[PDB]
Structures are given as structure tokens and as C-alpha cells.
Design a protein around this ligand. Structure first.
Ligand SMILES: NC(=O)C1=CN([C@@H]2O[C@H](COP(=O)(O)OP(=O)(O)OC[C@H]3O[C@@H](n4cnc5c(N)ncnc54)[C@H](OP(=O)(O)O)[C@@H]3O)[C@@H](O)[C@H]2O)C=CC1
Length: 310
């Protein structure tokens, strides 16, 4: 009906698939752009059975992109770090088509315009800032989503729940706060804000009050959930910093990210600005899965671990 048509790049991705599923659940005609040689064949079949329109192609196909843009209203990019500047290909098509009502670039993490990180990671988020500046320069309607930490991703990373080891690594003092959200919810809320006028040309942050915690508190709550105690092994902050200067790329990137999220506490180091929009306050019919509910999911049916591409 009146539902805006949504085009998603990287829809077969770790976070992208939750955006495709959320879009279809909400009744939006959904277009998924995917490479001709992608191995996400079974996933695409699932998307298709759910009503998605699959479009195979390369980002280098400028004409194809423009013709596709003319058929949709909203564009969401969930491309990975290695492809951040390749989003300029998407932006160029958006500009030529001229009918796009909202563009959401691939942010979905820290709020890069108000925080800084160690060189390995700083260089990467600067690429995301470059996309934002180009969007603003061209007056393209947008929504910048700071999703904070992907919960399943980092619960797996920090707790290694599938590992019967008796020790757990703690980065720094472990007292830094961070916010983490369930991937499925990040996907659903992202589709919602993409058409919500309250999110037009604004920074939307996902920071539900039930999802703020420290490494030490997460470990304590997990121990209670499974009835086991762990020996906490700390890696001093000055030690983490050294690694980012010697460990080569891409090995030093994850380390730099860990420092940003869990030592500097970048997702919780600032107060909201006048024009910021915290998403959990937007829809009374919805709510973010809480940390306790997340731990229950890991007890009953834990999702597999993942490693981002760098
Ligand atoms: N906040 C957090 O905790 C985290 C944030 N992130 C962020 O989420 C966003 C997406 O990350 P993530 O979901 O891990 O991305 P993925 O690594 O899952 O990649 C997304 C999609 O990109 C497409 N793709 C891969 N390589 C290429 C290429 N060479 N050319 C064109 N398309 C390509 C693939 O789709 P196909 O095969 O269909 O072409 C792929 O499924 C990023 O901005 C990332 O920084 C990610 C992890 C954690």
C-alpha cells in the first residue's frame, strides 16, 4: 500500500539480514542487493520465501543502481568496514536518481562524530564520517544510527559461552560501562526509524536503560545464570595500547575496538544532545530485549559467534 519501498545493501550480512527480516515483518516491499557470486544462496532463498525481491549485481554497475533507486523510496546500507568508501557508489546513484526519501549509511556502532579511538580504529570510523559529510554536503535526507554494541556478537566475544574454560579475560579494570543491543531488535528498530519523521536528518542512538552494563557485572550475572565461577584474568590498559602499535593490521583493529568499547567506554562516555533521539523512547508497542533476556537466550538457545571483516 502506502508502505515505503526499501532497498538494502549488504542485506545478507551479519546485521543486514535482521534489517531485511524486520522490513518484511513490517510489511515494506523489500529489495535486497547482493553480489552474483555471494555464498549466501540459502539465505537469499529464505528472503525470497518471505517476500523479498532479490537483485543480483555489483556496486560498480552505476546504471543498474540508478534504475533501481528510481523504483524505491528508502535506502539502507549494511556494508562491512572494507566497503565503507564503496558507499560513494551508492551515494552517486542516489544523487542521480533524485527520488530517495531517506538514506541510512552503514554506521550501526559508536557515535563517531562525538568520540575518538586509537589509530587502528580511528582510521576506520573516519571513513564513516567521510560518508556522513558527503551526505550532508549533498543535502541527502538521512538518519545516522548509533546502535552501540551488537549483543550476541559481544556476549560471544567476552564470555565465550561455548567454551568450557575456567577463566575469563577482562580488558582493563572492567569497570567501564557499555550498552549492547540484540541484533534482531537493531534490525527492527532501524527499519522503523527509517520512515519515522522524528528521525529525519537526525542521529538516533540505541541506548535502552536495561542494556547498560560493565564487563565485571556481565560476568557476575552470567556466573549466576549457569552456576559456575570463573577466574578473572585482566589485561591492563597500557598493555592493550601497546598491542595496537606493534600488532600489525588487521590484527590490531579488534584490539583497538576493545579498548574503545570496554576501556574508554565510548558507548556510554557522553550525555545526550538536544537533537539526539534515543530509540527506545519512540514506540510504546515495542521494547529492546534486555540483558537478562539475552543471557536467558544464551542459556537456552545460544546464537553462534561471529567475527567482523577488516
Ligand atoms: N556495533 C557492533 O557491535 C558492530 C558493528 N558492525 C557494523 O555493522 C555494519 C555491517 O557489518 P557486518 O554485518 O559484519 O557486515 P558483513 O561482513 O556481514 O558484510 C555485509 C555484506 O557485504 C557484502 N559484501 C562483502 N564483501 C563485499 C565486496 N567486496 N563488495 C560488495 N559487497 C560485499 C556481502 O553481501 P553479499 O554476499 O550479498 O554481496 C555481505 O553479506 C558495519 O558498519 C560494521 O562496522 C559489525 C560488527 C559489530
Amino acid at each position: 500500500g502506502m508502505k515505503s519501498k526499501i532497498l538494502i545493501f549488504g542485506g545478507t550480512g551479519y546485521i543486514g539480514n535482521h534489517m531485511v527480516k524486520g522490513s518484511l515483518k513490517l510489511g515494506h516491499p523489500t529489495y535486497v542487493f547482493t553480489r552474483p557470486n555471494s555464498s549466501k544462496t540459502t539465505l537469499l532463498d529464505e528472503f525470497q520465501s518471505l517476500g523479498a525481491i532479490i537483485v543480483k549485481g555489483e556496486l560498480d554497475e552505476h546504471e543498474k543502481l540508478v534504475e533501481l533507486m528510481k523504483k524505491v523510496d528508502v535506502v539502507i546500507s549494511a556494508l562491512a568496514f572494507p566497503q565503507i568508501l564503496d558507499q560513494f557508489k551508492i551515494l552517486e546513484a542516489i544523487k542521480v536518481a533524485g527520488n530517495i526519501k531517506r538514506f541510512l549509511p552503514s554506521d550501526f556502532g559508536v557515535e563517531e562524530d562525538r568520540i575518538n579511538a586509537l589509530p587502528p580504529f580511528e582510521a576506520l570510523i573516519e571513513r564513516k564520517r567521510m560518508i556522513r559529510r558527503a551526505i550532508e554536503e549533498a543535502n541527502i535526507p538521512y538518519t545516522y544510527v548509533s546502535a552501540n554494541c551488537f549483543a550476541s556478537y559481544f556476549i560471544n566475544y567476552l564470555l565465550r559461552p561455548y567454551d568450557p574454560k575456567d577463566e575469563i579475560t577482562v580488558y582493563g579494570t572492567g569497570e567501564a560501562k557499555f550498552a549492547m543491543n540484540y541484533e534482531q531488535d537493531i534490525g527492527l528498530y532501524t527499519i522503523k526509524v527509517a520512515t519515522d519523521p522524528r528521525a529525519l536528518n537526525r542521529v538516533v542512538i540505541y541506548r535502552p536503560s536495561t542494556n547498560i552494563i560493565t564487563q565485571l557485572e556481565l560476568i557476575s550475572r552470567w556466573e549466576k545464570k549457569i552456576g559456575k565461577k570463573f577466574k578473572k584474568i585482566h589485561v591492563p590498559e597500557e598493555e592493550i595500547v601497546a598491542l595496537t602499535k606493534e600488532l600489525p593490521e588487521p590484527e590490531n583493529i579488534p584490539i583497538a575496538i576493545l579498548h574503545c568499547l570496554f576501556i574508554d567506554g565510548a558507548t556510554m562516555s557522553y550525555d545526550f544532545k538536544e537533537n539526539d533521539v534515543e530509540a527506545s523512547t519512540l514506540y510504546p508497542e515495542l521494547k529492546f530485549t534486555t540483558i537478562d533476556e539475552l543471557l536467558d537466550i544464551f542459556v537456552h538457545d545460544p546464537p553462534p559467534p561471529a567475527s567482523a571483516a577488516f
